[PDB]
Structure formats: structure tokens, C-alpha cells
Amino acid sequence: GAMAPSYRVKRMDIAKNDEECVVNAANPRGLPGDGVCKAVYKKWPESFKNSATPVGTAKTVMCGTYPVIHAVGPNFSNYTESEGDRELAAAYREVAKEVTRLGVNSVAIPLLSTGVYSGGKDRLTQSLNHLFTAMDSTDADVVIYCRDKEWEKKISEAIQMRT
Ligand SMILES: [Cl-]
Ligand SMILES: [Cl-]
Ligand SMILES: [Cl-]
């Protein structure tokens, strides 16, 4: 547990994170994928041994002693808005269980289902609110990683709003 558990946001590649573990925005088949998933594959390829897991779940695989939590958000191209929302909330709840089980003091996390799984919609607020619902009861320092300058400002505002 962190002495004063916090949320922060950084605009940079999550493969360069300064946290005790990382959450991959994984596909269900444990494939290298694109975006965050391909950066994670290049940095921690050993963590993709038996990383396949269903939508709405998280599966942790160690790269050395460094934990990679593979979290599979829904692809909103394939899911209804209702069932996709349920699966996206569930994936973050499994991330909070894994972060707790590992006993880490810090975790690097991307916004699940906001890139090529977004079904072409802006899901910043939907994804970030499910992240908060899951992670608020954990005592890890959470550092959210993003790539877009306007998203950084909006995530930072949402964090500061709760204080
Ligand atoms: Cl970078
Ligand atoms: Cl995505
Ligand atoms: Cl982004």
C-alpha cells in the first residue's frame, strides 16, 4: 500500500512507466496486437506466455519479477453498448483484484476500450469512471497513461475534481 494513495496521469508510452507493475490493454488471444498491446509486447514479450483470457477478465504473467496484468476490454464493434459497458466494468474489477493480490504499491494503467476497441466513439469518461469504480478501494498509487494532449487535460481535470 502507498502511504497516501493517489491518482496521476502522464502522456507518454506505458512501456517507459515508473510503476511496480503494468496493465496491458490485451486482446483475448494473447496476440501482439497494435497500440498499447504492441508496445507491451516489444518491452515484455515473455509476459505473453499463456496470456490468452476471455473478455471482461485479467490474467497476470510475470516478465522476470515484473508483473504484466493482461486486461481484456470489449471491442464495441462486436458488443451492444449495454453488454460492452458490463464487460468493460468487469475487466477493471479483475484488474483491482490482481493489483491487490500482487501487493504492489503502484500500477501503470491505460484506458481500456478507448482505441481500436472503441467502436469509433469517444469513451474517455465511460472508461475512466469504470477505472475509478474498481481502483478507489485499492491503496496502490495509480498512474494513468494516455497519448493525446486533450485527453491528458480531461483525465487530469477528472482526477482534480474529486480533489
Ligand atoms: Cl514517450
Ligand atoms: Cl482499445
Ligand atoms: Cl489517448
Swiss-Prot record:
Look up the domain of life of the source: Viruses
Q: List each copy of the Macro domain by range.
A: 4-163
Q: Where the shown chain sits in the full protein?
A: 1334 to 1493 of 2474
Which residues does ADP-D-ribose bind? D13, N27, G35, G115, V116, Y117
Output the PTM entry.
Answer: Phosphorylated by host on serines and threonines.
The identity of this protein, by name, is Non-structural protein 3
Domain annotation text? In the N-terminus, the macro domain displays a mono-ADP-ribosylhydrolase activity. The central part called, the alphavirus unique domain (AUD) has a zinc-binding function. The C-terminus region, also called hypervariable domain (HVD), is mainly disordered and binds several host proteins. This intrinsically disordered domain contains 2 SH3 domain-binding sites and 2 FGDF motifs necessary and sufficient for the formation of nsP3/G3BP complexes.
Q: How does it assemble?
A: Interacts with mRNA-capping enzyme nsP1. Interacts (via C-terminus) with host G3BP1; this interaction inhibits the formation of host stress granules on viral mRNAs and the nsp3-G3BP1 complexes bind viral RNAs and probably orchestrate the assembly of viral replication complexes. Interacts (via C-terminus) with host G3BP2; this interaction inhibits the formation of host stress granules on viral mRNAs and the nsp3-G3BP2 complexes bind viral RNAs and probably orchestrate the assembly of viral replication complexes. Interacts (via C-terminus) with host NAP1L1.
Topological category with respect to the lipid bilayer = Peripheral membrane protein
Described by its record, this protein's role is as follows: Seems to be essential for minus-strand RNAs and subgenomic 26S mRNAs synthesis. Displays mono-ADP-ribosylhydrolase activity. ADP-ribosylation is a post-translational modification that controls various processes of the host cell and the virus probably needs to revert it for optimal viral replication. Binds proteins of G3BP family and sequesters them into the viral RNA replication complexes thereby inhibiting the formation of host stress granules on viral mRNAs.
Where is the protein found, in the record's own terms? Host cytoplasmic vesicle membrane
